[PDB]
UniProtKB/Swiss-Prot annotation, chains A, B:
Assigned protein family: Belongs to the herpesviridae major capsid protein family.
Gene name per UniProt: MCP
Portion held of the full protein: 1037 to 1086 of 1381
Organism superkingdom: Viruses
Free-text function comment from the UniProt entry: Self-assembles to form an icosahedral capsid with a T=16 symmetry, about 200 nm in diameter, and consisting of 150 hexons and 12 pentons (total of 162 capsomers). Hexons form the edges and faces of the capsid and are each composed of six MCP molecules. In contrast, one penton is found at each of the 12 vertices. Eleven of the pentons are MCP pentamers, while the last vertex is occupied by the portal complex.
Localization annotation: Virion; Host nucleus
Subunit-level organization: Homomultimer. Makes the hexons and eleven out of twelve pentons. Interacts with triplex proteins 1/TRX1 and 2/TRX2; adjacent capsomers are linked together in groups of three by triplexes, heterotrimeric complexes composed of one molecule of TRX1 and two molecules of TRX2. Interacts with scaffold protein; this interaction allows efficient MCP transport to the host nucleus. Interacts with capsid vertex component 2/CVC2. Interacts with the small capsomere-interacting protein/SCP.
Protein name: Major capsid protein
């Protein structure tokens, strides 16, 4: 327990799982939502996948 | 052509084409015929394989 001639300043990161709050004012963005396309992918005899 | 100390027991399995007869009484198995369905498998540029 002899103190050396230097001084150490120990640095560490700390990962913290926080819980944010999101505000967004009335009519902030504007969405142009279109009618979706449907495409029959799996032409199976057991079950069809659209 | 002098006998060794042992003998042998030669085992062959011999196949036979046999014409069979199958009896099966009426209402043996009940069936459910599903409707047949088509689907393309190998859609080659030369010829589509259904």
């Amino acid at each position: 327990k002899i103190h050396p001639g230097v001084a150490m300043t120990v640095v560490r990161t700390d990962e913290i799982l926080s819980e944010n709050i999101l505000f967004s004012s009335r009519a902030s963005t504007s969405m142009f939502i279109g009618t979706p396309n449907v495409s029959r992918r799996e032409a199976r005899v057991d079950a069809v996948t659209f």
